Amino acid sequence: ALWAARRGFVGGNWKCNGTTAKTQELVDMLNSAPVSFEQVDVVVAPPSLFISQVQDSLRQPRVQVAAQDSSTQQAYGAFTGELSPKMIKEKNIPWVVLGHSERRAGFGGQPGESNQVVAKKVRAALNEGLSVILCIGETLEERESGQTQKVLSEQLEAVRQAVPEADAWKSIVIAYEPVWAIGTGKTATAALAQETHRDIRNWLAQAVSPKVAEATRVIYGGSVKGSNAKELFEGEDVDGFLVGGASLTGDFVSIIDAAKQQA
Amino acid sequence: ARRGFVGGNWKCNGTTAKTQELVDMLNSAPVSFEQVDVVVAPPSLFISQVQDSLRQPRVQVAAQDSSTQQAYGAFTGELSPKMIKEKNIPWVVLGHSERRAGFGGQPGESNQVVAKKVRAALNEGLSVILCIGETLEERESGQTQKVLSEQLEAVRQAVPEADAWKSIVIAYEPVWAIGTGKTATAALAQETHRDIRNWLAQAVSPKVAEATRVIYGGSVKGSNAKELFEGEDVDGFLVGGASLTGDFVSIIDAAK
Ligand SMILES: [Cl-]
Numbered sequence: 267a268l269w270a271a272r273r274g275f276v277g278g279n280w281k282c283n284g285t286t287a288k289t290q291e292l293v294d295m296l297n298s299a300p301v302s303f304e305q306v307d308v309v310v311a312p313p314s315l316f317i318s319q320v321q322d323s324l325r326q327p328r329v330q331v332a333a334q335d336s337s338t339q340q341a342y343g344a345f346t347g348e349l350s351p352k353m354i355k356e357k358n359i360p361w362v363v364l365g366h367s368e369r370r371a372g373f374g375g376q377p378g379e380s381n382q383v384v385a386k387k388v389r390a391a392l393n394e395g396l397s398v399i400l401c402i403g404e405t406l407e408e409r410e411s412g413q414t415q416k417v418l419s420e421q422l423e424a425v426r427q428a429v430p431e432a433d434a435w436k437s438i439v440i441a442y443e444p445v446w447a448i449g450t451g452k453t454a455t456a457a458l459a460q461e462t463h464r465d466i467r468n469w470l471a472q473a474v475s476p477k478v479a480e481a482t483r484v485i486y487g488g489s490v491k492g493s494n495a496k497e498l499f500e501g502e503d504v505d506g507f508l509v510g511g512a513s514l515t516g517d518f519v520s521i522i523d524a525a526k527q528q529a
Numbered sequence: 530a531r532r533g534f535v536g537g538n539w540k541c542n543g544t545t546a547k548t549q550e551l552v553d554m555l556n557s558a559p560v561s562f563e564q565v566d567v568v569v570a571p572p573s574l575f576i577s578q579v580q581d582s583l584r585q586p587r588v589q590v591a592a593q594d595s596s597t598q599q600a601y602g603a604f605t606g607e608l609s610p611k612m613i614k615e616k617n618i619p620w621v622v623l624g625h626s627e628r629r630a631g632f633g634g635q636p637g638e639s640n641q642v643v644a645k646k647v648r649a650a651l652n653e654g655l656s657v658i659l660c661i662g663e664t665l666e667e668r669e670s671g672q673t674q675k676v677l678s679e680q681l682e683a684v685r686q687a688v689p690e691a692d693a694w695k696s697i698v699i700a701y702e703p704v705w706a707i708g709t710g711k712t713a714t715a716a717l718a719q720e721t722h723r724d725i726r727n728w729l730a731q732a733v734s735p736k737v738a739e740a741t742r743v744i745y746g747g748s749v750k751g752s753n754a755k756e757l758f759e760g761e762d763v764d765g766f767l768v769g770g771a772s773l774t775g776d777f778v779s780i781i782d783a784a785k
């Protein structure tokens with residue numbers, strides 16, 4: 267190699283949005299995008315129904331596909347409605363998103379995924395050879411009462427208890443999404459993102475190792491747009507983005523373009 | 530005359546090649562499917578492949594779950610009933626005991642959550658395989674009717690209109706029969722199915738009671754399906770492990 271630097275990363279989380287035609291449109295946008303993706307790992311996470319269609323028509327090796335969740339149940343068996351990491355890997359899907367705040371909160375009255383459940387999913391995924399976009403983030407109340415570092419440490423420490431081997435962390439990307447920035451239009455400042463991402467990297471260094479700290483991409487999400495991404499990416503510890511609503515439009519290609527440093 | 534119904538729940542089993550094999554088995558099956566509704570439920574990753582290659586009109590596809598969140602939006606890792614319907618998937622399985630129990634320390638789906646899923650699915654034009662069933666402890670302590678009534682009544686509170694029940698098939702799966710080899714006796718299944726049908730008649734309407742398929746699951750095999758189907762209130766089967774092999778075709782043939 268010539269250089270040792272963390273490669274930029276942009277994930278697109280489509281959430282619960284998608285049809286056969288809209289999937290085709292997004293894939294066509296990614297295939298024709300007149301921006302080079304050479305310097306950036308790009309990952310897109312369609313709803314599970316549409317992943318095979320994306321795998322069949324995507325013609326950019328530099329874009330990889332992800333599932334939006336992966337089961338606590340690691341292998342094949344009697345787990346109705348669950349996609350296990352072994353299934354996902356054997357279907358040639360290289361990435362999964364785990365611990366998104368929407369899944370930590372839960373749906374329709376069903377309790378969500380605790381720190382411990384997320385950690386169990388992460389361990390199972392890594393055991394089966396997947397790479398993981400691990401989501402963490404504090405609430406508005408936690409932020410305003412000065413608890414962000416304590417909270418993010420608790421979320422990450424649960425993952426470390428389940429994945430105590432440092433080598434496994436090679437295939438983790440951490441997505442810092444403050445809950446208060448999700449869907450609200452309240453994008454973190456460039457200064458707040460950089461500060462918190464550096465706290466996350468200092469956590470990796472103390473709890474896992476300095477090597478894991480230097481290699482792990484820490485990406486920002488929460489109201490990311492083409493028009494705010496370049497300023498966000500000036501932070502030395504901001505390695506890219508996890509993109510929600512903007513992943514469904516042409517704005518996604520502008521965000522990818524922002525996750526490059528040029529001389 | 531209630532039309533026979535056989536569902537095949539593949540559960541968390543599937544690869545691209547095994548999906549192809551199962552679809553080839555269904556396409557070449559040397560039974561007529563004329564007298565029986567057949568539905569198969571692949572993992573969500575493989576549904577579109579099954580939709581592309583299945584060449585048996587009489588077989589339809591299903592998802593194994595459907596979200597409490599009805600439409601499109603910010604629901605990471607959820608498949609909404611609206612999405613499922615717009616992808617031309619006509620059926621969903623809801624309230625399977627595996628999902629009521631939950632996975633890996635995450636709490637499972639309450640009676641109320643299952644009911645919310647049912648209502649959302651029916652609102653979007655889906656048909657629903659609604660799963661109910663008691664535990665071994667509940668069975669042995671005389672609580673089967675109480676438990677099944679609670680599970681069904683939660684759904685009725687969310688779906689009080691009797692017309693909406695046209696698109697429900699009830700799957701009775703005693704938890705103690707799932708994955709254990711302990712198939713219910715033909716007598717126990719028929720008795721409980723009749724209790725379930727009397728519940729429909731009193732709580733919903735006599736018409737709903739007469740039309741609703743009530744299907745049995747829990748260690749169903751080709752070798753036990755014919756005897757099970759002699760029950761007047763046993764309208765077919767929800768098949769787990771045997772849905773992954775040629776034995777599934779023998780089960781379909783038993784529900785004629
Ligand atoms: Cl996101």
Ligand SMILES: [Cl-]
Nearest residue numbers: 538746768769
């Ligand atoms: Cl089943």
